[PDB]
Design a binder for this molecule. Sequence first.
Ligand SMILES: C=CC1=C(C)[C@@H](Cc2[nH]c(/C=C3N=C(/C=C4\NC(=O)[C@H](C)[C@H]4CC)C(C)=C\3CCC(=O)O)c(CCC(=O)O)c2C)NC1=O
Ligand SMILES: C=CC1=C(C)[C@@H](Cc2[nH]c(/C=C3N=C(/C=C4\NC(=O)[C@H](C)[C@H]4CC)C(C)=C\3CCC(=O)O)c(CCC(=O)O)c2C)NC1=O
Ligand SMILES: C=CC1=C(C)[C@@H](Cc2[nH]c(/C=C3N=C(/C=C4\NC(=O)[C@H](C)[C@H]4CC)C(C)=C\3CCC(=O)O)c(CCC(=O)O)c2C)NC1=O
Ligand SMILES: CCC1=C(C)/C(=C/C2=NC(=C\c3[nH]c(/C=C4\NC(=O)[C@H](C)[C@H]4CC)c(C)c3CCC(=O)O)/C(CCC(=O)O)=C2C)NC1=O
Ligand SMILES: CCC1=C(C)/C(=C/C2=NC(=C\c3[nH]c(/C=C4\NC(=O)[C@H](C)[C@H]4CC)c(C)c3CCC(=O)O)/C(CCC(=O)O)=C2C)NC1=O
Ligand SMILES: CCC1=C(C)/C(=C/C2=NC(=C\c3[nH]c(/C=C4\NC(=O)[C@H](C)[C@H]4CC)c(C)c3CCC(=O)O)/C(CCC(=O)O)=C2C)NC1=O
Ligand SMILES: CCC1=C(C)/C(=C/C2=NC(=C\c3[nH]c(/C=C4\NC(=O)[C@H](C)[C@H]4CC)c(C)c3CCC(=O)O)/C(CCC(=O)O)=C2C)NC1=O
Ligand SMILES: CCC1=C(C)/C(=C/C2=NC(=C\c3[nH]c(/C=C4\NC(=O)[C@H](C)[C@H]4CC)c(C)c3CCC(=O)O)/C(CCC(=O)O)=C2C)NC1=O
Ligand SMILES: CCC1=C(C)/C(=C/C2=NC(=C\c3[nH]c(/C=C4\NC(=O)[C@H](C)[C@H]4CC)c(C)c3CCC(=O)O)/C(CCC(=O)O)=C2C)NC1=O
Ligand SMILES: CCC1=C(C)/C(=C/C2=NC(=C\c3[nH]c(/C=C4\NC(=O)[C@H](C)[C@H]4CC)c(C)c3CCC(=O)O)/C(CCC(=O)O)=C2C)NC1=O
Lengths: 61, 97, 160, 160, 172, 172, 172, 161, 161, 49, 227
Amino acid sequence: SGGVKVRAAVGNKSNVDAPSFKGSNMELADSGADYKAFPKRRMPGANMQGFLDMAKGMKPK
Amino acid sequence: IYQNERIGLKGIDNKFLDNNLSVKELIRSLAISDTFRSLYWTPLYVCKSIEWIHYRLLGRPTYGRQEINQYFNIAYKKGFVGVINSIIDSVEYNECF
Amino acid sequence: SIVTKSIVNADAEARYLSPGELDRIKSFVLSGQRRLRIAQTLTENRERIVKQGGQQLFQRRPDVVSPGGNAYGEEMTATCLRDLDYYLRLVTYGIIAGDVTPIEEIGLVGVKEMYSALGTPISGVAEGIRCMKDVACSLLSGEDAAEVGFYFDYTLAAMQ
Amino acid sequence: SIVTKSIVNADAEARYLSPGELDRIKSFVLSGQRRLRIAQTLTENRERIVKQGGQQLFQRRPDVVSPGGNAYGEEMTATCLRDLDYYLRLVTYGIIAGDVTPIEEIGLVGVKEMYSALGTPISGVAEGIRCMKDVACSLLSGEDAAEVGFYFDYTLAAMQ
Amino acid sequence: MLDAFAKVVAQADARGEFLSNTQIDALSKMVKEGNQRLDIVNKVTSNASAIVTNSARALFAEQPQLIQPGGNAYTSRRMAACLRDMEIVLRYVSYAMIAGDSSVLDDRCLNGLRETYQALGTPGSSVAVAIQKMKDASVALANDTTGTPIGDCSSLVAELAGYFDRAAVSVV
Amino acid sequence: MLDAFAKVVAQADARGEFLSNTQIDALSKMVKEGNQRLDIVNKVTSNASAIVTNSARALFAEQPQLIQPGGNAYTSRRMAACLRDMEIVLRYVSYAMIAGDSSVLDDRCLNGLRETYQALGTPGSSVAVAIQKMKDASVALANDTTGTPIGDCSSLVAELAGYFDRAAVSVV
Amino acid sequence: MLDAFAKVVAQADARGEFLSNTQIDALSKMVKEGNQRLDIVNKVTSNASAIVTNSARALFAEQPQLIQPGGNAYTSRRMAACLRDMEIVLRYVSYAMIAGDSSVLDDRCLNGLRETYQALGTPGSSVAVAIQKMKDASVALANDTTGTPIGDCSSLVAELAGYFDRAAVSVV
Amino acid sequence: MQDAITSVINAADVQGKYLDANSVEKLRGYFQTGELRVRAAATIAANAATIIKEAVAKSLLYSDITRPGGNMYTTRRYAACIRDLDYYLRYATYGMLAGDPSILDERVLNGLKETYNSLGVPIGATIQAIQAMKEVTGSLVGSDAGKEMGLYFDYICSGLS
Amino acid sequence: MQDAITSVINAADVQGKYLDANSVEKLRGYFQTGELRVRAAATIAANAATIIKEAVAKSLLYSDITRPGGNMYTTRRYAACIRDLDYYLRYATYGMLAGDPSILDERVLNGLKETYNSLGVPIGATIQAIQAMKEVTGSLVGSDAGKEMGLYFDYICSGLS
Amino acid sequence: FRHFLGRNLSSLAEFQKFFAILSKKGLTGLVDSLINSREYSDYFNEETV
Amino acid sequence: SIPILKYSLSTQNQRVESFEVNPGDEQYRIYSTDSLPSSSEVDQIIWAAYRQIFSEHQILKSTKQPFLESQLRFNQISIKDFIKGLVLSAPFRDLNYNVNNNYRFVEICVQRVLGRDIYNEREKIAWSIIIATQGLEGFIDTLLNTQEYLSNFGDSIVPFQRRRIIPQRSKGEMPFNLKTPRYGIEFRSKLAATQFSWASPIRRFRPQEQQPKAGDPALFLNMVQEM
Ligand SMILES: C=CC1=C(C)[C@@H](Cc2[nH]c(/C=C3N=C(/C=C4\NC(=O)[C@H](C)[C@H]4CC)C(C)=C\3CCC(=O)O)c(CCC(=O)O)c2C)NC1=O
Ligand SMILES: C=CC1=C(C)[C@@H](Cc2[nH]c(/C=C3N=C(/C=C4\NC(=O)[C@H](C)[C@H]4CC)C(C)=C\3CCC(=O)O)c(CCC(=O)O)c2C)NC1=O
Ligand SMILES: C=CC1=C(C)[C@@H](Cc2[nH]c(/C=C3N=C(/C=C4\NC(=O)[C@H](C)[C@H]4CC)C(C)=C\3CCC(=O)O)c(CCC(=O)O)c2C)NC1=O
Ligand SMILES: CCC1=C(C)/C(=C/C2=NC(=C\c3[nH]c(/C=C4\NC(=O)[C@H](C)[C@H]4CC)c(C)c3CCC(=O)O)/C(CCC(=O)O)=C2C)NC1=O
Ligand SMILES: CCC1=C(C)/C(=C/C2=NC(=C\c3[nH]c(/C=C4\NC(=O)[C@H](C)[C@H]4CC)c(C)c3CCC(=O)O)/C(CCC(=O)O)=C2C)NC1=O
Ligand SMILES: CCC1=C(C)/C(=C/C2=NC(=C\c3[nH]c(/C=C4\NC(=O)[C@H](C)[C@H]4CC)c(C)c3CCC(=O)O)/C(CCC(=O)O)=C2C)NC1=O
Ligand SMILES: CCC1=C(C)/C(=C/C2=NC(=C\c3[nH]c(/C=C4\NC(=O)[C@H](C)[C@H]4CC)c(C)c3CCC(=O)O)/C(CCC(=O)O)=C2C)NC1=O
Ligand SMILES: CCC1=C(C)/C(=C/C2=NC(=C\c3[nH]c(/C=C4\NC(=O)[C@H](C)[C@H]4CC)c(C)c3CCC(=O)O)/C(CCC(=O)O)=C2C)NC1=O
Ligand SMILES: CCC1=C(C)/C(=C/C2=NC(=C\c3[nH]c(/C=C4\NC(=O)[C@H](C)[C@H]4CC)c(C)c3CCC(=O)O)/C(CCC(=O)O)=C2C)NC1=O
Ligand SMILES: CCC1=C(C)/C(=C/C2=NC(=C\c3[nH]c(/C=C4\NC(=O)[C@H](C)[C@H]4CC)c(C)c3CCC(=O)O)/C(CCC(=O)O)=C2C)NC1=O
């Protein structure tokens, strides 16, 4: 036992009110972690190196 | 059908009984009912219902995939009533009946 | 229930459920707390709701219990009250399902074929359910009696 | 029965039934008049064969009915006699079928798994059937008691 | 508590009509049988302590484990309580015979008798055996044609038999 | 048995400190109008007799079946017991108005009243509107400015209306 | 109430069996340790109020949230109740030490005691450590050899220990 | 075709007894999640085309079923897929509202795996499309609502397997 | 037949990429619960017969499937139940250790509901037996471990439905 | 074949050879014709289940 | 010096009034010693005291109190001192006090002595410390000096179960000897090794195929016989 009077008794109630933004400092719950197993897809590769190299041709136009 | 569920169709019968309705419109008025939808479209597979419904309205089963494709594709867009209308308004119904 | 036929309605129409359908599934499930209380009242009042139900039924239809009536003797009168216990049970299902769909496909579809084929006066069993309705609505407040009585009179309508 | 497994025996062997098999189907059906009389004796003696059956069972096995026994109290003792009514019924089937084939696939196949899984002492229920056997054979002549007792002791053998 | 006449008055009191003139003929048929009723009761209340002990003695030969050491009705504290317990059932059965209706049988005797045999551990099936022992002694003594005119009393001993097997199914 | 003066003293030493002065003037919020409190309760107490008699007669014009034969309040003992309950509930809201809180209302009257009304076959709906018939007729009888000095006291007529419906949510 | 002798008799009368010769000798084993059984209890009642106040102070060297404002054993009615219940529990285990079995301990004190404290709100395991602060204040007080001569009596103080932890698990 | 209330009423009716405390105990559990299911079925109706576009591009868009010879080559065959995937995302929405997967095997599962074998539709790629479609559905409706909608997707994948 | 590590490796391998931070993030989450699952599978192995004896006596012991005519009447049929319930409590233990319900549908769920319909086994009473068996399993292994073992019971009940 | 060989039938003629045996000798003629084949012995001879 | 735990009341029949002037049939028979009974009518009071405080069982020869009976007949003690001698009687200790705990014995001494049910379960908690501190002889005189004992029994009436039945009805409540027996289910189940080991005899054999199932008209034959 430290202050034997129970530390607190949270000095009274002045303007003590509920509109206290619970957790106003600061953030929380990170989303980029969740863990989906599939990527977001894309095309090209194999069967298709011909046309990518070849859409560079008109890319700049 | 039993008398409990035929009460909902009594507006359709005597409309036919005073000679205000054809047979084809009578057949479509029965098939598009909820009494029919609750019996042969709802409790069945989406492709078996099209097969059964095709066999009552037209007097034969489906021929092949293209015929059963076509009515079945209609159920994608319009649904149950859209399939019944597409059979009674078909060319083969109007030719045989 | 309201959930299953609001689905099969929008199922047939090749579409999803409108706000008119989804603001009522929503409105029904918040109503679900109050429905179980109403069905809970009729659940353990079947001793009085049935026995007083057959009370007024025989006072109003002594023919069915008199010698020659369908429910004559110790035997048929027991089955005479058995059916009222059935229909009182289905009303508890309709209150929790929020619709007469449970009462529809049980005890209503083709009911005239059964009772005509049993020799029972179908009008007599309709009188029995009405006598149960006055006992049931006498057990609940006005806001509830507009529901519990509401399912009985549907059963009265389909039973004639 | 003797008819069905004399068939499935000769069925598996790709052959018909021998004289040894057909002179016994013949010998069994002429025995059928005497079998129904024997089963008719046990049919409406189940009140005395079961209740006196559980008589000697508790006097010989007071543990099962004492506090801590599996059949303790008004509840379990009623089910304690219920099983004896079952096995007494199957013996009436075996007598009319001329074989323990009805008793085999009912009340014997996998019986140790049930009673071990119910916490019941399987040896205790075997003692119950033996007590029923002395009551049953005391109700019939010597020529019959060699049969009615004969099916009980098979049930005793398979029940341990 | 009701008698037989009170159940016809209080039934139509809830309906609220006057008692009909064809219901008076059923009440006047009861008072014609009112003096054959009073010597069914007098036959069973006079041999009352021998209906009890001859039925207990027949019970304890069929089920000997109730009185053997470690049994329920074993000691002299509890043989007397078992012998009392059939005197109370025979008391209220004869009460419901003299009233004509069973409204005092299932009110001060059977109202929770089953739920106190689960708390005491008494075998309730054996109390319903010893009630049917007492039913067989009491309907044989209500057929006794000594000191009484000869007549047909079969409908009133079948009512005394009804209150015996009501109190037997209310303990099991 | 605590009141509104002892309401905050229960929360005082449950925390465990002396009385903060944000409420000491706010306990002097109603010892000013405690002189306004006692002449509000002088109309439900000194005119209690017209409330139970008028509203019960108007109730039976709303439900005609509760004075029929077969109704719940049909004989003379029931109809005397019905006003016995209605003069014991607005007894205790005069016990609730004198103390500020509603701790003597639910305990000494309503603690089990929903159970015994289901255990008697009384409908809980019509015993709620028996108090709603005497809810608005108690505050409108409380709003007589004649015989008294004048001024708006709409705080206390929401408190006393807030205790009549507390019984009406405890009986259904 | 059964002592150690009656528990042998009540098990033998239930089976209807006499007492054996080697059963008599184990009870004759108990009476030659009779002075050693008795003068243990001559310690634990003659220093009995010391065992209460030493353990009750030392409980709040371990859990001082009971005496906290808002805590269970805070108030002076409730501090007088916490010394009351530890005086009763010490009283019944002295009765069992003169008996020889715990049959007066779990028929008077410990039977149905968990369901009291959960309906009271008293912390269940937090009174069990108050019992274990009384055992070591008493089993060390039993090993003290003031006035009596010297012999091996560790078997009897294990039973004196054996009542204090049978009672400890009946309040958790 | 039974919802959670229909299944509760059926089991309580099939024994001929009233709705006891256990039957109403599950019914109260269904009414508690009634608010969650509608909002789950709300957003799924809005993003129906977007969810199916996300699943096919994430699972089987560039695989060689998409190329010539693969099971999805011709435009009629490709168009049948998104028509076909629409039913899985739609009927799963019905199971999520009804709280009972009886509608799936009644109207989807029966004769389904027996039909794909007839056409030669790859059941392996089909389930992974539904698995990817289940993954995006958990994005929209949230975690627990995704747990509910996801509970009927794998029911389709299990029976279709 | 994949565990949590096998499923994580498969998804990370099926895209041809290494085990990035998200793949190892779930793997660390599985290793944290590795201590809980073994003790959960420990006590379930000990009380296997006791759990099944508790479930059948609590769900379907005295119902009229147990009586003549019911689906469980004969001793061969009764003995098949506790044999049958042993697999559900056993395979659910495997899913609880592997952390992935792939083994259930691989070895239990496929052809299961199609088999009970053949035999005529009541699926309704089966799920309630597993639900009651799930209830007793939460008694032994605790709350969170019961949440883990319970997560695979309803997976069986869902697919078996 | 699922039991005494751990595999399904392979061809059509492998059916008719083993159906005619079961057709003429029943169960005792069929199982002895599987256990006495070479394919049993190559995988399992006398010791391996 | 430690007052009682302040419990709460409930809704009961004895704390309202009946409006029963000239009560008809279900009166529970006020046996009293101000009506000046004869010596055969003192004996109908002493049996009513034994039936109230014991049950109908323990009116045996060994459980009678023949010296307490003679002091009632000499008008030395009252009825209130005669009820106090029956709870402190040595048959009432070994039959009704050694076989249940202190929270069930308070349910006996309020049902039989005060004639009312218990209010709620806190009153059994609030009363059971009186028996464990100052004893059973300190428990009865603080129960016989309550206002509920004096305002309807007094110094001359053997107690009774007040307002068991509702006057238009015929069913009412349960009698208190059939409510709380000598021992309960919690004392009987814990002793099944030494005492109370009985195992139960055989019931009458009902065959299993004669039992009614849902939708059988034999489940309504008890309804039809009440018509
Ligand atoms: C307080 C005492 C008291 C009684 C004991 C009875 C005694 C009694 N019973 C009867 C009269 C009768 N008693 C019987 C009774 C019986 N006949 C039998 O064969 C049975 C053994 C037996 C009853 C079970 C019958 C049948 C009559 C009527 C005679 C008849 O109508 O045939 C009468 C003549 C009444 C008359 O003449 O109108 C009397 C006094 N009544 C009493 O008030
Ligand atoms: C010993 C018992 C005792 C009483 C019975 C009351 C009676 C009473 N009330 C008021 C005086 C008053 N009483 C009321 C109350 C009301 N007036 C209304 O118009 C409303 C209908 C009603 C609300 C309940 C008001 C408003 C005043 C005027 C004082 C004020 O509030 O400004 C006064 C004048 C002195 C004062 O203001 O306190 C007295 C004696 N006071 C007592 O000491
Ligand atoms: C009023 C109660 C009451 C008693 C307690 C005993 C007191 C007492 N104890 C002993 C006698 C004894 N008392 C003890 C007991 C103990 N010795 C120890 O060292 C331990 C501290 C303690 C046991 C825990 C022993 C061991 C003996 C025997 C002496 C010996 O061993 O030689 C004797 C001598 C004669 C006899 O053996 O009885 C007496 C009078 N008598 C009574 O009337
Ligand atoms: C859940 C919906 C449902 C209903 C309603 C139902 C009715 C039903 N009523 C029956 C008989 C009967 N029902 C009655 C009924 C009556 N007699 C009267 O006078 C009255 C008018 C009426 C009752 C209020 C009688 C007398 C019999 C027996 C008829 C006979 O024995 O021939 C029977 C045959 C016996 C049986 O199996 O119970 C059925 C199946 N079954 C159902 O599944
Ligand atoms: C036709 C073949 C057949 C048999 C034999 C059978 C037995 C059977 N015995 C049961 C229970 C039981 N059986 C007993 C039996 C006994 N207790 C004892 O002490 C004795 C040794 C023994 C009887 C002689 C008890 C006590 C129970 C209830 C166990 C419990 O409640 O946990 C149950 C569960 C409840 C029920 O549905 O009845 C079944 C199914 N079923 C069958 O189909
Ligand atoms: C108001 C009318 C009334 C009823 C209905 C009633 C039932 C009743 N039966 C009782 C006991 C008893 N009942 C029996 C009876 C039996 N045990 C057996 O072994 C046999 C099967 C059976 C009878 C032959 C026994 C032995 C007791 C004593 C319990 C004991 O001391 O352990 C008891 C506890 C003590 C007593 O009062 O006798 C009650 C309260 N008592 C009443 O006052
Ligand atoms: C059969 C023998 C017997 C036992 C064992 C018994 C226990 C008992 N302890 C009680 C209260 C109590 N018991 C405690 C004791 C404690 N609370 C704590 O926080 C500490 C852990 C512990 C003290 C060290 C307290 C504080 C109360 C008062 C509860 C109250 O009045 O609200 C009460 C409620 C009545 C009262 O005393 O106010 C009973 C009936 N009564 C008996 O007749
Ligand atoms: C409501 C329940 C239900 C389902 C699910 C259903 C499926 C169904 N899918 C079909 C075809 C098809 N389904 C696919 C699907 C695919 N190709 C792939 O590579 C993928 C793995 C997969 C998309 C996920 C394709 C390509 C066809 C056309 C096959 C052909 O033209 O031969 C057809 C043939 C007729 C038609 O589409 O018009 C039916 C009936 N019917 C039903 O009633
Ligand atoms: C490892 C995954 C797996 C499962 C689950 C499985 C089930 C399975 N359950 C069976 C039978 C059975 N299953 C039951 C079960 C029940 N009866 C009831 O009333 C209850 C609802 C239920 C117990 C929970 C019964 C009674 C049979 C015997 C059916 C018969 O003899 O016709 C059979 C037929 C063959 C046999 O038991 O030897 C199989 C193959 N096989 C598998 O490979
Ligand atoms: C602690 C203070 C206290 C409360 C709270 C209390 C309630 C109470 N109300 C009762 C009855 C009753 N209450 C009513 C009241 C009504 N029934 C109706 O139909 C109307 C809708 C409504 C009133 C207008 C009636 C009619 C009875 C008597 C029932 C009967 O005897 O048939 C009874 C049964 C005993 C009696 O006849 O008085 C109790 C104990 N009693 C108390 O002493």
